[PDB]
Design an enzyme around this catalytic site. Structure first.
Site, PDB file in Angstrom:
ATOM      1  N   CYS A 241     129.647 121.197 113.317  1.00  0.00           N
ATOM      2  CA  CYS A 241     129.977 122.462 112.648  1.00  0.00           C
ATOM      3  C   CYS A 241     130.915 123.228 113.576  1.00  0.00           C
ATOM      4  O   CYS A 241     131.782 122.593 114.188  1.00  0.00           O
ATOM      5  CB  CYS A 241     128.721 123.288 112.298  1.00  0.00           C
TER       6      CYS A 241
ATOM      7  N   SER B 108     123.877 125.613 114.651  1.00  0.00           N
ATOM      8  CA  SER B 108     123.104 126.080 113.499  1.00  0.00           C
ATOM      9  C   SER B 108     123.368 125.228 112.257  1.00  0.00           C
ATOM     10  O   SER B 108     122.451 124.564 111.744  1.00  0.00           O
ATOM     11  CB  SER B 108     123.432 127.563 113.276  1.00  0.00           C
ATOM     12  N   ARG B 109     124.603 125.189 111.766  1.00  0.00           N
ATOM     13  CA  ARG B 109     124.876 124.443 110.528  1.00  0.00           C
ATOM     14  C   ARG B 109     124.611 122.926 110.709  1.00  0.00           C
ATOM     15  O   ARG B 109     123.878 122.320 109.925  1.00  0.00           O
ATOM     16  CB  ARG B 109     126.306 124.678 110.077  1.00  0.00           C
TER      17      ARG B 109
END
Length: 168
Positions: free
Chosen positions: A96, A101-102
Site C-alpha cells: 500500500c 494499514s491497507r
C-alpha cells in the site's frame, strides 16, 4: 524493505517506494502484486512487464469499506501462491503506501481465512478481536510497523465472524 510474512507462503508486504523498486521485485522473485491502493506498475521496466497485478482504490481511513474487497483480495493472494495446465506457484507482494494499514489488512484477511486454527478457531472463548489481534502480531514478527486503522480492525473482526467467506 519488502518483508516476508512468517510461515510457509512466499508472501511479502511493503509500502509504495519498495513496491516500485525493480531491484526488490527481482530479489524476491515476485510474480504477483496486489496494490491495496490505487497503483499502476511500470510495464516498460522488464521487472514488471509480466507481473500479475491487481489494484484496489482505497484510502487508509476508518470509514473506508475494505470488507467488500476481502473475498477478491484473498482469492488473488491464494491463487497467486498456488499458481492456478501445470500449476506454477507464485510469489505475492501485497503493498500500500506505508505497508502499515491497507496492505496489512489484506494479509491478515488471507491469514485468518487460510489458518483459522492458528489464530484460535476453537478455543471456544476465542473472540474475533482476539483472533485478529493474534494475526496482527503474527504479521508484526516481520513487519513491525504493521497496524491497521481502527475501522479496518473492526472490519477484520466482521470478516472472521462471517466465517471468512472468500468463495465467489
Amino acid at each position: 524493505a519488502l518483508n516476508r510474512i512468517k510461515g510457509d507462503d512466499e508472501l511479502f508486504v511493503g509500502g509504495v517506494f519498495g513496491a516500485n523498486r525493480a531491484r526488490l521485485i527481482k530479489e524476491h522473485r515476485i510474480t504477483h502484486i496486489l496494490s491495496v491502493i490505487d497503483h499502476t506498475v511500470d510495464r516498460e521496466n522488464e521487472a514488471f512487464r509480466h507481473v500479475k497485478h491487481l489494484s484496489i482504490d482505497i484510502d487508509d481511513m476508518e470509514d473506508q469499506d475494505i470488507l467488500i474487497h476481502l473475498p477478491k483480495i484473498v482469492r488473488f493472494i491464494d491463487s497467486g501462491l498456488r499458481g492456478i495446465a501445470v500449476a506454477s506457484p507464485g510469489v505475492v507482494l501485497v503493498h500500500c503506501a506505508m505497508g502499515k494499514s491497507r496492505s496489512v489488512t489484506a494479509i491478515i484477511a488471507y491469514l485468518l481465512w487460510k489458518y483459522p486454527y492458528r489464530f484460535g478457531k476453537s478455543d471456544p472463548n476465542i473472540s474475533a478481536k482476539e483472533a485478529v489481534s493474534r494475526a496482527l502480531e503474527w504479521v508484526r514478527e516481520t513487519r513491525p510497523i504493521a497496524g491497521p486503522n481502527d475501522g479496518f480492525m473492526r472490519q477484520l473482526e466482521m470478516w472472521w465472524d462471517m466465517g471468512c467467506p472468500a468463495d465467489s
